[model samples]
Target: GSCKGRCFELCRCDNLCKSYTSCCHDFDELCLKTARGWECTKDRCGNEENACHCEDCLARGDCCTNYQVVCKGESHWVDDDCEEIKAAECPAGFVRPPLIIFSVDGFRASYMKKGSKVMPNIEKLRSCGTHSPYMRPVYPTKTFPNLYTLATGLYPESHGIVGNSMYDPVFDATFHLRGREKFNHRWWGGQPLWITATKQGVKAGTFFWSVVIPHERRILTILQWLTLPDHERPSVYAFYSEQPDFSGHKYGPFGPEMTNPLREIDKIVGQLMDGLKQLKLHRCVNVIFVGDHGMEDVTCDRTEFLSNYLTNVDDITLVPGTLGRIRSKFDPKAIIANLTCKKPDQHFKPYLKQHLPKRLHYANNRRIEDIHLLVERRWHVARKPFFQGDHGFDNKVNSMQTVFVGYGSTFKYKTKVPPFENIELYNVMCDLLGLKPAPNNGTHGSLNHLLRTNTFRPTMPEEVTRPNYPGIMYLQSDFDLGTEERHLLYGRPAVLYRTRYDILYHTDFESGYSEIFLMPLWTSYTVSKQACVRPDVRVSPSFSQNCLAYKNDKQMSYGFLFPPYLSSSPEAKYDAFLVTNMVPMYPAFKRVWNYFQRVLVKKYASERNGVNVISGPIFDYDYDGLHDTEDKIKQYVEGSSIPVPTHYYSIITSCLDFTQPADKCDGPLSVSSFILPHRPDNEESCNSSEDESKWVEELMKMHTARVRDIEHLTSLDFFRKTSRSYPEILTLKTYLHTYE
Candidate 1:
């Protein structure tokens, strides 16, 4: 072999690389790739960098870079340097079903239970798919944060969207619903499911979704997107409707306006189902129905104004509503001092950032402001009350609970899971779409039971325990009827019997004060000897002089106790009177009785001074659907024919001062009357953690009426004996908690 130059000369380090001798080291390269792309390299190893070497190739206008490829059916990559192969096609019979999300703003879980008949389409889906009576939203339960959390699977803190109006320090920007700044994607850090689906080559769309304001559209428009081709159509679609929430915000949550929007949405849901059926996609598509949060009633009478306390109102920014967040340039100590000057009632409480409840996860975020103001369940913080309904209360409260319903092939049939946090919905969307979920703050297993294949067993029912008590007694002296007429077939008193306690009065008949149908209304007892000579004891139905006899050798009696009369002495006796009536013992009645003992008695009377309490069943009408005739009454009970009362009444009165004589203190009396339906309550409807004040208010609105109203309905005068004037208890405003 001949060489143009000498072999020794060709071996030179820089020039010999072009000759037959290998002068260029394996680690030597002229260019290298960096994060910003390729440039002239100082040193490169022998291993070639399989990256975007743009600088070296860009000079020649040629660069090997990774590109997003929309291949035949599957999406991947093809490099010009690597060998090429045929594009892969989607497997035969493979089809991606559609995923539809329905966001009904302010659709409280109770709405579905209360208006089940109004929404047959929803009921049908509820019966066939996975659903929850309520879905718990994050603290400061605002709409925007919850809706975004549903999409992003992140808490308001992690997602950087803490409220409908947010201030982001990172961006040094304020994002509000009314402004165009909210539309900027910079404020939203979490990747929503729609964006993730799009990145993974799946089409996604939204209609009226709270986070993505640009794609907002009507429900009908989004429905049309379901029928488009797979490549062009959105595999994931989210739609939001603002009817119920709008109406709720205008009027109150319980206003008549709320019903109309709910009915209209109900019809729209039906129309959506019909449309899906028409397109033959109902079975293939998964539809998730949810609400951002529930609403609570707010009134002008119970509002706390921030401006009233602040010296310079402009220094503090108060996002007024049911829940208020105060941002101020003023000192924190000054703000706290001014707000807590009078130590205003528990309706409004202010807290510094560090002292906020850890469970809320609300304090850590910059958008949460310096001081967090939480209004009571049904109270508000506003300059003037403009809206009747509001949300943003403690999510733990039942009034702040919303609904969750899911239908489609991916969901389990006829599954009704307990309430879950709304943050978990993001993972659900990810799991349904077969996409890798982005890092989120949601618990993956919290809602996995809603899926079809999950093997989740329901909780077992608890055993019922019966309490022991003394037998009932008959007061023949209280009855005006003759002895002969009072004696029934079994020689028991035929006429109504009366029993007196230190604080309670009741009318008893064949079915003693309580009946054998169910357990006693009240379970716990506290005894005192200051008011009574002996401690009060629970009356047993078996040994009682007058007790309700049941079938199958069972005996039942009702127990009555005046919470105001109970003494503080541990050794003192606590007596519970027994009465029998044809009244059915349901959760509603139990709830009323429990509320009276737990809330009203504590408010009205103390252990030393008792409130005058009168409770009895209304027998004038057969409200329990039982026949009122003598023959029907006999057939109603096992041993005694007692007609079931349709409703019960309770009248509680407390003198202005318990220490003052009734004759001396005759001004305004604290009187409250409750008329509860005798019909059995829905066991499922009873929430243990229900706000007592709110529940009492609702009961007053729905069941309680004026003394005149109750008198008109029952044909009984409750305050006839009292010569003093009694004003109507139109509004009973009280706070359950007090903060110093």
Candidate 2:
């Protein structure tokens, strides 16, 4: 039992791990010193994990005393010295190499990297195959959503499976993670791989169950199907198991309890390879291995009770766990007000659906409600703690990241691709099957480098159903407002939008103003040329002398934006001097922030042919993550209740073409966005440096974000009208310009 929580035996950690004490036996000395001291040590040669993890130590004859019995038990050996399975001649009537997907549910990405020392069969396959460093899942990191995402290459928002449980309006149906309602075609929106393969003239089928017996049954089922006559055999197949995830949940993804389950999964991987080889189709068929989402520990015993925050929990109909969907007659303000306050003790944060962080790509689906109560990672919003381990958290968190590896006829031998999202899997699989993919979120040729050669392509700005299984409970349903996969068609505007929002045009500029805060939210313009200088002059705006709360003081005035300064025409310069161009300024952050408008924004565009600019104001009066409600408005104009913003942001977008505005550029655009605060000088990092020009030497790297970040804060979709000509809008919109 000394191997209880030893490195390599149990537990997966992110960030640096520390405090390795009291778990398993003979737990090597080196293992205890490192942060990863929590798992059993079992490293083999050429696997530098010699830092207490052993395998090469077997050669050196000093490996961990229990490594052999624990990690290399007969059923799960790291060495490829097993007896070969039978090999036979090829069968007839196959149009292309068959494809199979073997999903190791809840497998973390890092484990795949060490398959060489833990899973021999998969190791051999991936060695002569292609594997990504990791495969990112869509947000909510739940099984159904990610698995469906992988099968369809669509975000849950686009596919209509928002989470394990979601309520739909049209059918008044409540889809549960394990219920019959999920089997209905109406609940699954996107075309899955099997459907995709079949629609485009190929045969596909599925064989999945959740453990060891089911794992073996999957192999038996596939063998039986493949042995069927050419007409009946499935050309594409899927195999799923419930080992690791099941074990992971009960044991909290930690401790020696996970060892047997993990070892069993490894055994199935080897057995499947042996089975494939026995058919003499090991190389003839393509096998793609993947994981849906990762497991995280909720053993912290921390849970948030809704009753503590709500006046009456009975009035609101709520969804369970990570997703809090509330259906009520009252204004969201009643709930939003209580939940929106920044609480030091609160474990969860609530938001209006529109206010969800755009990186999640979650707000557009009808399955999702208008109110979201997002619990932090490693935390839950249930009445009390439930499972010791769980998932359905933000996909960006390490605990939610999964894995991917593919092998077979079309794959490049010994290739290792960089980390990518599971959404790219469908496109790659379609290409492998010699079929065109459906319009989806996957970028064109995004995963091409992993292939030995290219396949036929489909044009897309756009874009499967899984089978039913046992064990599920029903949840309730309700109506959420409309949203859709909105791209542009021929007569569409020059910009793109997931959904349309209002915009107003000014001199060489256009803006989206907010009625909620009574001010301009975002303004867009282009800077094609500029002189070597910059300036800032504040004046009264919109109402001119009428709304003059800021005009009465020297510290506050209508701040003129930087776009009009580039033009030498005093008339055009005189243009920004107009009333509509001003916002009542409060903070003297211009020296460090707007100075970026000079050093980077102004300089990069003029020097690099052209650039597009979109700048806006943010209102979060409570300093909480949520955009504050009107009642929480802390700062207001003296003469008017018009809200003063919490922060201002500037975004810089560029494209290859100098003729059109870069913000509206169709694809492969370079983007830079920054969010600056309007707080007191104590806002450490935002105003870290004193020199204005030096502060912006690389503006894209600091306080920087993707274009989607700006969209989230402003509630305005950008690059909307121009999205029609682009198929890779997701990539361009999500581009991080800092590194380049």
Candidate 3:
């Protein structure tokens, strides 16, 4: 072995060097030789255990210390660990997929289903890429709103552009599609994709989109610009074209008029693909041919006048020309009552802003106004046909659904995903560009299958076993504070020690029961790749024995603090049914929470090595953003005297290294914390499908918080003992993540 034991500052030539103790002080000078480091040769590399740790190890970021110096990226073997994992793409280099969004305005999902040769290029792309059957554009399904939703990864309500025409209470002014109000930052609430790209140093260019919105550039010009050198070229591009949308409105969705506009879009995509192929850049770039919203055919026969429903139209500020978006100068309640349908065949329904379908996420914005009238599909609410086709309707309608086709080396080929919301595109774009996504409404991992390889891929174990305690089982490192100090980590409960087994030690998860609410304040447990099938026994019958202690606790129910089904051991599962391992919870809250833990969290754990969870309840009766100090004894379960919790919290801690548990992990732990409000989640129609999981996931993302916030609310020292040795532990708790 050349320089096997030798120590040099430039690089570690010694393959035996452990943690750089026997290696050089720097890698800059010695790591110039790229080829040698990639292979397991006599030449000294980095200290790692893997026999063949080149491409696979490097991508995981656990490459040899001298791998950079010796290998210089010349290794042919890219240990594609994700190769076996279905749908994961392990690309050759660190340079991530460049994102290009080609938004073909008003391209209905139905257009492609016709299977016409009009969009052959799209069919070709889909053959080599992935496409959703249809993508659910957020409501109200209009060009401006869905476009803004796509750009900002937010719903119409989250982004202030609720409609193509809307009134802002903040400015007491109207913003129309052709208005200069779009230039005003106040009207655009969420971060646009171009701003996020450019601000994050990923140069972006737009044609019929931002960066050059005022001056629309030709597709040829942008494609030519992509051929420039890396620094000069815009890696992130948003090229939008108005084609089918213009013609769709001119002549309702299908006709001779559709041919030209649809062909123009097809030609544009052809040009884009051909241009990339000519430049030899097609393989590296990711392209998403998306639609802002779809076109709906409207007929005069189905038109209903607003005057037919309400005698006093002056009560509500109805925006003219068809889509029933209503604002109010007076009480919305009065307008809502009068705005009711006059006949059984009436084409629209009115809702108070707060009462709109909660799943739409359209109610919270002030711009949405008070009286939101949901217009019926295929019907005009208040207009004679200014345009033959319109699209400001509910997103669920078939006509309102739009297209989504993703292509490139990064996306899966020939895969078809179920219809997903358009809001997730922002996160997907950020992930592709390797930029941290700005806060948005997208749920992480909901659209995981869309990409070939992810930065983090969940792994499934062949079978489950007891977690070995050789290393960091408690998020502790290889180095410890000492056995006595580590031993201090275990707890002692009330009625301490008549005997060891007779005490609180008779359980799988540890807990400290609360005296005030007679519930568990916090739960500490680890869940990993456990093949624990949930038993038929829903509740631990033993919990009923303790409920007798409470005085008429009818409205309250006990829920698992550390869900028993997560562990494989029967002892642990049965022990988890103890009263100390539960808290009084609302049925809806418990249902949504338990289901999330059961399905999504379980899936996550099965893919990962394992994770440690610390969760508990909170009481914030005032609705103010603070821990409650007043009226602790005030409100109880409606039928009982025991106090009810206002909120619940969960802090999931795990190693970024997928194969290692936190206790055995070699790095700082990552956290995903959530603070859920304790209430009934009656959002909409849910009949136990994948959509319901996504719905719950969306609701979960809204309440994400820093681990420290939960700690502050619970008045618990979560990482106190763990912090003494790990100086950066508190930073982990204090941190809130937008992206990994």
Write down the RMSD of all candidates, one decimal each.
23.2, 16.4, 20.0
List, residue by residue over 486-602, the lDDT tens digit for candidate 3.
Answer: 111322212211111111233345554444444555666666566311211212222212454233554566577778667557665766665446566766676777876788676
**What ranges in model 2 sit over 4 Å off?**
1-92, 113-115, 207-213, 383-386, 457-740
List, residue by residue over 1-740, the lDDT tens digit for candidate 2.
Answer: 44333332213221112222233443343233333321234443224333234434444322333344446552223344433222212566776778888887788775554445556666666665787767788878888888889888888888898888877887887888655677678777788888888788788765344222235545545644565567767788888886578877788765467767767777777656655544556657777888998888886457777777777777787775655677763467678667764465566767666555444667777777777877777887853224688878766677777878877667776778767778878888988888888888776575776777776533433201111121213221221101011111111122222322233443466554443454455666666544411111121122122234565554554465544545447665754654434566655555554565555666777765566666777765543323455787777766665667766777666665655445345545566666665644422233244555444443325355555555545544455445433434445555544341
What's the true lDDT of residue 21 in model 1?
Answer: 39
CA shift of 250, model 2, Å = 1.8
Of 1 and 2, the candidate ahead on TM-score is 2
lDDT of 1 at 137: 83
What tens digits encode model 1's per-residue C-alpha lDDT throughout 129-162? 7887678788778888888888888778778888
Look at candidate 1 and tell me the lDDT of residue 159.
83
In model 1, where do residues sit more than 4 Å from their true spots? 1-94, 207-219, 383-386, 454-740
Scored against the true structure, residue 168 in model 2 reaches a CA lDDT of 83
In order, the Cα lDDT scores of the candidates are 0.53, 0.59, 0.59
Per-residue lDDT, model 3, residue 376, is: 72
Among all candidates shown, the one with the greatest TM-score: 2
- Candidate 1 has a TM-score of 0.49
